[PDB]
């Protein structure tokens, strides 16, 4: 009501006389009518390669705190707030998408409400590209990210009120395991790497490095019941099994797309663990590409995301997920994933291929059993 | 379309050219430029634009994409330039003016050309366009409210490619003269969208020339059901007089239909299609409400995304799916797809669709 009933009586209007979105390559002067703020120097995206956005949920949380402090300042009670970025098409895309995600997640706006101010802006915003090294050939838009973040909130996958910013920022760091809790069911992480940082004669010290220790301890404390490895071996799986966590290999080559048989095995394995109330932690080398393929397929199967929405939501939590040709692969198989809800069932007999969990089987076979 | 050099096969090893404000599609052969002046042909380069001759005809603030008739005419001009002996050792630079809307139209038309004429795949035509600065203007709808939904070149390319893969577009049998004639107001303002569907503007009767033109075409092109979605502007008896079933499924102008209406429409269309007939659908303009129902059937049948479906519909008939109908199609696309598994065509006719067979749950089907 500081938002909707107050204000002033190259800028986009979100709420008349109260919230605007500008783009300036300079620092505009505050007036008795206007207060301008940017977050670009403190809140910024860390590119893998030529990806530049969108901003992630931690960025958004920090923006919301800053935004609210400006809105709640009695000094600004009769002012229009102009959130602004620099004038590049990439920085404008990041600022606009982050403000939209704010309205979706904090203010319960609907997608068409937040997208109406942004439509047909000239110059257009730069579409978001993947984090891989090949030339971009697939883009997602603010519309995709907004719809994905909105659908995820509607399905209970995003809850800014329980969001722990300190935990999010800690575990995204390489030295603490480079992982993100994506949903209540899934963790995506980079492969642990077994080494010997204390040498080979430190007989009363673990040879596990700090990121490996951090991953094992968080997993043991947060009900991870299955770890799925998608890349070549860089560690001995016994470290997970000795701590009570099932370990499953579903390896396919770096940067490639999985055979649907691998995807079907993964969905069945994940369904078995979710039915028990457990979490599934999935890694490839980076925990971005191959990992996004399998988790993304399960999200589409479960929640009905479009492939573009699924990619946008995944990247909002963990930047860089789904790489290169994996984007077109998810886009082209999304109907397959969604409609497995009708053409498959969870088998009643265990499968050795997924370590005794239950695979997805055809409808005619669940009839037999 | 005259035959020309085949740009699918690896072809001839040709040297790259480099120009500012120019994107490379095929090294040494096909480039896309954007210039506010008229560039001069060199001995290594021939430039051409079609902005002087191929016009998008906007309803309100829509600006594109260019339609299949536009694309067909572009292909003829393009092939003429490619087949000219004077150009055998030049790079062809297709270009537009520098506005983000005109660049969007030119880029999308060239992509649709590569998809439809040269058998390129979406990731092949989209790679040259990704991350271009400044970006292309996304495409907006033809309605009068402020835009709140955009489709991209990626959406249009994927929808046109999927349509081609499903046999809904075939430039070898495409009749440009018929296409251009019948979209004129005085000849009925209609387009054949697919082998199964025609979308048209409502006829008007105080018969005038566009009404007669519609009746003549429908009688000779196997339309077996006309579906009216708007208030009555003509006497339906004239369609029945030529043996075509007429059905009202009227809902309010500028709104979205109840799913019960959509389910009835899909069952009606399936009944007609199974008998080998076409369905012709109109509202007032034959764009908004018409796009909702035909789009739902296309998604149900072929698995288009909503964005692809809108892109393909507008590629054949500009302006289809208006305002809030875009978000509606987007939010219900899973519903249309899931009906393939949760429903069957009833075996009992329904008088709510004039004796055709509606969609019913697997349950009611079991009893039957």
UniProtKB/Swiss-Prot annotation, chain B:
Gene Ontology MF: a single term: protein tyrosine phosphatase activity
GO cellular component: cellular bud neck; cytoplasm; mitotic spindle; mitotic spindle pole body; new mitotic spindle pole body; nucleolus; nucleus; RENT complex
Top-rank taxon: Eukaryota
Keywords recorded for this protein, A-Z: Cell cycle, Cell division, Cytoplasm, Hydrolase, Meiosis, Mitosis, Nucleus, Phosphoprotein, Protein phosphatase
Limits of the Tyrosine-protein phosphatase domain: 202-342
Catalytic activity: O-phospho-L-tyrosyl-[protein] + H2O = L-tyrosyl-[protein] + phosphate
Phenotype for residue 283 to S: Inactivates catalytic activity and leads to substrate retention
pH dependence (UniProt free text): Optimum pH is 6.9.
Catalytic residues (UniProt): 283 (phosphocysteine intermediate)
Function description: Protein phosphatase which antagonizes mitotic cyclin-dependent kinase CDC28, the inactivation of which is essential for exit from mitosis. To access its substrates, is released from nucleolar sequestration during mitosis. Plays an essential in coordinating the nuclear division cycle with cytokinesis through the cytokinesis checkpoint. Involved in chromosome segregation, where it is required for meiosis I spindle dissambly as well as for establishing two consecutive chromosome segregation phases.
Note: Present with 8550 molecules/cell in log phase SD medium.
Subunit structure, interactors included: Component of the RENT (regulator of nucleolar silencing and telophase) complex which is composed of at least NET1, CDC14 and SIR2. Interacts with CDC5, CRM1, SIC1, TOF2 and UTP7.
Protein name (Swiss-Prot/TrEMBL): Tyrosine-protein phosphatase CDC14
Record organism: Saccharomyces cerevisiae (strain ATCC 204508 / S288c)
Name of encoding gene: CDC14
Span within the parent record: 1 to 368 of 551
